[PDB]
Write a protein that binds this DNA or RNA. Structure first.
Ligand code: MG
Ligand code: MG
Ligand code: MG
Ligand code: MG
Ligand code: MG
Ligand code: MG
Ligand code: MG
Ligand code: MG
Ligand code: MG
Ligand code: MG
Ligand code: MG
Ligand code: MG
Ligand code: MG
Ligand code: MG
Ligand code: MG
Ligand code: MG
Ligand code: MG
Ligand code: MG
Ligand code: MG
Ligand code: MG
Ligand code: MG
Ligand code: MG
Ligand code: MG
Ligand code: MG
Ligand code: MG
Ligand code: MG
Ligand code: MG
Ligand code: MG
Ligand code: MG
Ligand code: MG
Ligand code: MG
Ligand code: MG
Lengths: 130, 96, 157, 236
RNA sequence: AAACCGGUUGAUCCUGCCGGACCCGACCGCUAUCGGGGUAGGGCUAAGCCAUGCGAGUCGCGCGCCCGGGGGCGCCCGGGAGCGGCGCACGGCUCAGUAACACGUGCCUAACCUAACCUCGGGAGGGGGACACCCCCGGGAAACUGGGGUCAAUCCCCCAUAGGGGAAGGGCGCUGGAAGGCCCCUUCCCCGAAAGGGCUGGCGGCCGAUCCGCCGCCAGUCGCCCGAGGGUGGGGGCACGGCCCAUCAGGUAGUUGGCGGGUUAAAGGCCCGCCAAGCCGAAGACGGGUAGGGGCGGUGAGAGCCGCGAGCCCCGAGAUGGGCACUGAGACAAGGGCCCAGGCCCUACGGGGUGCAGCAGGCGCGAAUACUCCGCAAUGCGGGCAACCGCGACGGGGCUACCCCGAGUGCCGGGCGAAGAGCCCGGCUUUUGCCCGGUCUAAAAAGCCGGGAGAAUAAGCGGGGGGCAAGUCUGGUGUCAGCCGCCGCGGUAAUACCAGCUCCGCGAGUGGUCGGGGUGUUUACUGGGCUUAAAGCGCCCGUAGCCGGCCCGGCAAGUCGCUCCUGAAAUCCCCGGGCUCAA
């Protein structure tokens, strides 16, 4: 979304560590961001198409069950099932709360897989077998 | 600026000159400061009364300070109750 | 932040010390000779003269190559106005011009010098009241600077 | 959207002080805003057929004016370089050609020439099916097969048939061709492309045209080849 | 005109300050006839409070219904309440915040989005639904709003296909300075179009006056959807440039950077998890003060100084203070929403509305200020196929000593008067003022042409001792009253005060106080001074900085020459032309 609660605009701090005044009192809607929308490991896949800036659309995986796991050693794509998240190297809190992010390790039925997609931005979990 | 006249005062001219230049004490509306304002013109003081609204204006002189023989006066009266003291003195207008 | 507004054009002719007795005498002489309304008219004429003289000075200060495409048209325009009588004089002679040459080009002055009026003030009254025709049209401004080609086309009603 | 008269382009043939505070804003069409003139401005200030914006809009709305083979009923339609303007009830045909004095002028052209437009190629893209889309100087596009698209390079010129939607001829950018300056300062000059300094950015290369002994310089972006020693279409 | 004048002495040469004379801006006093040109007017004062009115609509060629007139073919014309599309994020105001990528100049986005419009290529098949107006009932003080019934769509939704996105592998090929991009091939996952709708004409068929339609085809035309590019607007980044203070020297701890992620349309400590100690500073950090930036403006011969850097144009920010969102291509939205604060208005006490920094207008403040007027005719914009409609934008007048321009307040001869003013006499003219017509004007007003009587309707402000032009003329007062920017007068014989007469300067203006420039070579680059006039630190070491020997070779950074892309317009200088010249 474009939310003032998740403003991505500039700081008020200079590189010298000092403060600077606010050139603009209000927060631009163009500079607003949104909350995290990474999927939670669940019992069925739930997808939600959201309207974004300029009328485009973004598919959000609000809950993820299946992963498109690719085996390069077989050159094959299999739609596997996620038993669990083994680790989230970006932040362990994601794996602890059972959230799937890019670079996360997931134990699917084919084995361990690295998530090669942005599940909060792409709406699907493309994974590569390890 | 504007002011309200409080008392009529007379300052003594500087040493070589002998005279009692007649001024008033004026309290400015915007600040409340009380300052001595010279009332020019022969008989000009008689057109001034206590509690009369006056227009206070710089006396001239070098660098905005006091004038020739008047010690420590920086202002003078230009208007009395909305009518110019010059016009009142010349008879072109009557003080309201 | 500045907004441009028009300025007085007679400032270049107006002197900075008015209280000189010699300057007052010469200005009074010129004013009475040509029947001018006030000192502003004389100072406007002097401003015109100052423009002409400073243009001459500037063209003199420019190099020969730069001066070449401007020297002849400048003298031609002065001759056509009537301020200079010989359009082929040297440029430095233009520096010695006089305000009386500009004052002669006034419509009131020309009406008096053509013998159409009993006096210069009567010529001014004629131009004001509209009895002076310039090539068929009434020119009612006594301060109009008549050119050489239009000088002979002045009539009375 | 509004166009303040101060922000109107400087080459436009309109007074800068005497008039209203507004100018007719071109309606985002097939040219650049600063290198095009609206159709109402062409009708009122360039041809003097209409005395007001109301009369110009009436004339345009009737469909009397044709631009590049298509009737234009919008009074804000942009008109730009090399466009063919055709008046229907009178039969007069102009080309918007570069001009030394007015920077862009409507010069009458023959009826046989009215169906051709010399368009400078501005770029190429690869599109679906493996085809090549040529993008021209006025935003027009042409999709062609890859083999014909391979040999046409940027900054070339093509004489294009408006009525057939085809490339009548291709004029490649070579030294010694006749070129016209379509932009800045040295505008309208026609001469022989005889000298180039190839900068690292190809668009900013220094080009020199010659007309006998008349040598002018511009950048490569600002010239358009209009053929060899004789221009293909009447530009002057 | 590249200017000096008065003042410190018994007198003299200096220094040096203060005053005079000029221009501009603000306010103010006395006075004021006309016309033209111009983007003048609560800015310099509270972003202080507001009664009242107006200030964004348009489309029947998207849609159904109702009403009235007309007519027979398949409807014609007009109106109404609406749904629906597009617009209202442009335009108008103001100057609190801001010393900042705000602004200006020069470049980027290969890190991005964009309705409307343009072009090229392709597509438009099947099906379904609801809500207004309306009818029957209301409720409520009002605001607003409930239930049932019922007709539609270019309204809303599903299905199919096209298309799209993510991950991975490969490639001749494209663009481009350079591919993390485009195209092609391969695999999986995921998302997922459209209005053939309106009109016109033609054809055919179904149907009925209880209808005036529905359907199939064709052509024209305005439209709809996908892909690519452009256009326009917007988001973001970069280098450099433009204030004061050291009686402000250390500041910073998400602070500086890296790595991995989230979010975004998109890069980024934008945000998050871990890791390191980094980053700024005397070439002035940090702190404080002041201020919207620019084009530009005033002044001076110029260098320069100043901001009147108010009005006009461009960018920025804001809409009582502070926050947060909906819709939408675009807002966190001045005449839309929600909350806290702080006010206020209506009420039937249960509720509702509201903040003029929109155009008029009122209160307040202050030294200081315009009509609650007229029109969409010009300039443009939104809507519409169009015709047209709307617009306190804009245009027009009003008021106001806003700036510039051109004129009048008579001319001629004679007399008295002084050669002056003035009066009288004889003649002339009618700008101007007054009345009428045409033209002009959206209409008016004014302007211009023409007609009528008529000298007839029209001059003030400051000053006269020197500076500094103008009285040792007259009366009054008598160091009192008063003058006086400076020097200085007045204490009985005043050229200086109060009056008369008279003269002087400028003149529809002329004066007072302020601020800027000149003055001023008293800020000194051009271009000052430091023995004694103000001014060499008590002396020395040395960091940054500034300044630096000779010759030869290379470079070409400064420098110089030419050229190109630029530095918006207006403004400024020159030239030509058009307003009666002028402005
Ligand atoms: Mg003194
Ligand atoms: Mg002495
Ligand atoms: Mg205000
Ligand atoms: Mg239509
Ligand atoms: Mg209706
Ligand atoms: Mg705006
Ligand atoms: Mg639709
Ligand atoms: Mg693609
Ligand atoms: Mg679908
Ligand atoms: Mg349908
Ligand atoms: Mg990222
Ligand atoms: Mg930060
Ligand atoms: Mg000087
Ligand atoms: Mg204004
Ligand atoms: Mg607020
Ligand atoms: Mg709001
Ligand atoms: Mg308010
Ligand atoms: Mg108002
Ligand atoms: Mg109109
Ligand atoms: Mg005048
Ligand atoms: Mg006599
Ligand atoms: Mg009239
Ligand atoms: Mg007098
Ligand atoms: Mg006297
Ligand atoms: Mg004298
Ligand atoms: Mg005196
Ligand atoms: Mg000195
Ligand atoms: Mg000493
Ligand atoms: Mg010593
Ligand atoms: Mg010491
Ligand atoms: Mg000592
Ligand atoms: Mg060099």
């Amino acid at each position: 979304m474009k939310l003032g609660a998740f403003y991505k605009g500039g700081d008020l701090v200079k590189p010298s560590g000092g403060k600077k005044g606010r050139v603009r009192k209000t927060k631009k809607k163009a500079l607003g961001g949104g909350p995290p929308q990474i999927p939670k490991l669940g019992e069925e896949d739930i997808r939600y198409v959201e309207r974004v800036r300029g009328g485009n659309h973004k598919v959000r995986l609000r809950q993820a069950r299946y992963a498109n796991v690719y085996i390069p050693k077989e050159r094959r794509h299999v739609k596997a099932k996620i038993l669990s998240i083994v680790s989230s190297p970006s932040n362990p809190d994601y794996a602890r709360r059972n959230y799937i992010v890019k670079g996360a390790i997931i134990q699917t039925e084919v084995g361990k897989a690295v998530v090669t997609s942005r599940p909060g931005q792409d709406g699907v979990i493309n994974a590569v077998l390890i | 600026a504007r002011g309200i006249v409080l008392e009529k005062v007379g300052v003594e001219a500087r040493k070589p000159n002998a005279a009692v230049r007649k001024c008033v004490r004026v309290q400015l509306v915007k600040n409340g400061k009380v300052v001595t304002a010279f009332v020019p013109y022969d008989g000009g003081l008689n057109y001034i009364n206590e509690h009369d609204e006056v227009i206070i204006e710089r006396i001239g002189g070098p660098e905005g300070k006091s004038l020739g023989d008047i010690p420590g006066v920086r202002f003078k009266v230009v208007k009395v109750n909305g009518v110019s003291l010059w016009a009142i003195w010349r008879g072109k207008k009557q003080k309201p | 932040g500045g907004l441009k507004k028009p300025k007085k054009k007679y400032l270049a002719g107006k002197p900075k010390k008015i209280w000189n007795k010699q300057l007052l005498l010469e200005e009074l002489q010129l004013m009475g000779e040509y029947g001018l309304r006030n000192k502003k008219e004389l100072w406007l004429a002097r401003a015109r003269l100052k423009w002409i003289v400073r243009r001459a000075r500037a063209l003199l200060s420019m190099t020969a190559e730069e001066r070449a495409p401007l020297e002849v048209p400048f003298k031609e325009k002065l001759y056509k106005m009537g301020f200079i009588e010989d359009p082929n004089v040297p440029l430095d002679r233009i520096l010695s011009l006089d305000v009386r040459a500009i004052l002669e080009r006034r419509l009131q002055t020309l009406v008096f010098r053509m013998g159409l009026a009993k006096s210069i003030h009567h010529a001014r009254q004629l131009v004001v009241h509209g009895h002076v025709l310039v090539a068929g049209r009434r020119v009612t401004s006594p301060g109009f600077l008549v050119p050489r080609e239009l000088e002979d086309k002045i009539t009375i009603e | 959207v509004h166009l303040r008269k101060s922000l109107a382009p400087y080459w436009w043939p309109i007074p800068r002080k005497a008039g209203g505070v507004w100018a007719v804003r071109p309606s985002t069409g097939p040219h650049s805003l600063e290198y095009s003139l609206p159709l109402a401005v062409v009708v009122r200030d360039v041809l003097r057929y209409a005395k007001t914006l109301r009369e110009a809009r009436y004339i345009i709305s009737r469909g009397y004016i044709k631009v590049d083979g298509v009737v234009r009923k919008d009074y804000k339609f942009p008109i730009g370089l090399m466009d063919v303007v055709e008046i229907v009830p009178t039969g007069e045909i102009y080309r918007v050609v570069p001009d030394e004095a007015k920077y862009y002028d409507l010069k009458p052209i023959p009826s046989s020439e009215a169906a051709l437009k010399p368009l400078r190629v501005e770029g190429k893209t690869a599109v679906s099916g493996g085809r090549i889309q040529l993008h021209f100087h006025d935003g027009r596009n042409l999709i062609l097969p890859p083999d014909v698209g391979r040999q046409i390079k940027t900054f070339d010129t093509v004489v294009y048939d408006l009525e057939n939607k085809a490339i009548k001829t291709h004029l490649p950018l070579r030294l010694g061709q006749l070129a016209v300056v379509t932009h800045g300062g040295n505008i309208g000059f026609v001469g022989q492309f005889f000298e180039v300094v190839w900068t690292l950015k190809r668009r900013q290369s220094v080009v020199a045209l010659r007309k006998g002994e008349e040598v002018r310089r511009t950048i490569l972006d600002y010239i358009m080849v209009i053929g060899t020693e004789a221009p293909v279409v009447k530009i002057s």
